[PDB]
């Protein structure tokens, strides 16, 4: 989602240990690796038939999703292949027998397989620590118009 350039960066945008053997005659000549994320997350057709790399993708990357699967509204999508989700919840206080609202903004990596805007419900899954803040990857999206 840069967008419209897979040959953007200084290094070659590969898939690692995946070879396009050039002496072989395959009409299409393009081999894209992909996996099942698991837990009944239907890998989008955009990832399988796409042209992007994203090594941090839960389908087309070297990061297996294990842990827990959280959900939240998207707040910010301003930085490259990373969003921020606001996980609104109530915190019950045992003295006043009452609750209070808390944000907990979580930063999440979006693979180009999906498209998100401000105010979409996403379901994210825990993965290896991607960067200093982001721990979760986007696996589902539900844009309610």
């Amino acid at each position: 989602s840069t967008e419209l350039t897979v040959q953007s960066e200084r290094a070659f945008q590969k898939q690692p240990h995946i070879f396009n053997n050039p002496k072989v005659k395959t009409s299409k000549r393009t081999k894209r690796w992909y996996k099942n994320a698991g837990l009944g997350f239907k890998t989008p057709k955009t990832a399988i038939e796409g042209s992007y790399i994203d090594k941090k993708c839960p389908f087309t990357g070297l990061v297996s999703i294990r842990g827990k699967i959280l959900t939240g509204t998207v707040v910010s999508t301003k930085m490259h292949r990373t969003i921020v989700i606001r996980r609104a919840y109530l915190h019950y206080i045992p003295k006043y027998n009452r609750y209070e609202k808390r944000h907990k903004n979580v930063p999440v990596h979006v693979s180009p397989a999906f498209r998100v805007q401000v105010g979409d419900i996403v379901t994210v899954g825990q993965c290896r620590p991607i960067s200093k803040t982001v721990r979760f990857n986007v696996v589902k999206v539900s844009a309610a118009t």
């Binding site: 698991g38 837990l39 009944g40």
Partner: protein, 257 residues
């Protein structure tokens, strides 16, 4: 912490040894071995407390270094050797062959067995994979690994080990109608039969067990141990047979005598 700990303070010990609160501030820190520290029972606590064969933890050294107490048919003179579930502590003198299984309440009761029976263990099948040179191996809860199993032995199954040689003999698969020992939940010590289990994907697969009173309780398949099928258990079950009587009826049994 700056390296691994080697002392265990008395209060911080596992409760199911029953280690009196007073008399010494330390407990037997069980050495590394076949079973986990919390789920094990060191030879010190077995010989000195449960059997009362030795007074102190110095007299058990005189018992162990005189090569008597074989844990899985092998001598084993380590005073804090973690002997655990399904191990056959064999005192060659007196001719006693104790298989350490759980008391109904959730402790290791002393359970004397014959020698005909004290020549296998029933290893619960943990991971199975191909090792180097594409050789399939099975690893059991004991830390025993067995190359060339039956290719029908999957995870959660149980496997009779020869324990004289150390080879698989017979194996029991894990599904409905099979007898099960529970291996530490609060349902620790209970013996029932499987009704049906769940398919919780990366979320702890629970199983619904029914005992011999139509009493159904739920436990995790890692605390669940396949012991046999209905009627003929592959080992001798201890007096009680993991029924778990409620406070009233168990007091009525105790007071009838």
């Amino acid at each position: 912490a700056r390296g691994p700990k080697k002392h265990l303070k008395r209060l911080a010990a596992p409760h199911h040894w029953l280690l009196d609160k007073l008399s010494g501030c330390y407990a037997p820190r069980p050495s590394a071995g076949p079973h986990k520290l919390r789920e094990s029972l060191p030879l010190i606590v077995f010989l000195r407390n449960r059997l009362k064969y030795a007074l102190n933890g110095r007299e058990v050294k005189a018992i162990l270094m005189q090569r008597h107490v074989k844990v899985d048919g092998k001598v084993r003179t380590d005073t804090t050797y973690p002997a655990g579930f399904m191990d056959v502590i064999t005192l060659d003198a007196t001719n006693e062959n104790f298989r350490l299984v759980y008391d109904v309440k959730g402790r290791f009761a002393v359970h004397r067995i014959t020698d005909e029976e004290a020549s296998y263990k029933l290893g619960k099948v943990k991971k199975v994979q191909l090792g180097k040179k594409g050789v399939p191996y099975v690893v059991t809860h004991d830390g025993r690994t067995i190359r060339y199993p039956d290719p029908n032995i999957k995870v959660n199954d149980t496997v009779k080990i020869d324990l004289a040689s150390g080879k698989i003999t017979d194996f029991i698969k894990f599904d409905a109608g099979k007898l099960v020992y529970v291996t530490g939940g609060r349902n620790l010590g209970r013996i029932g039969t499987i009704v049906h289990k769940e398919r919780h994907d990366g979320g702890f697969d629970l199983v619904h067990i029914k005992d011999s009173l139509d009493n159904t309780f739920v436990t995790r398949l890692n605390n669940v141990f396949v012991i046999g099928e209905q009627g003929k258990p592959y080992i001798s079950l201890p007096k009680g047979k993991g029924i778990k009587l409620s406070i009233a009826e168990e007091r009525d049994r105790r007071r009838a005598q």
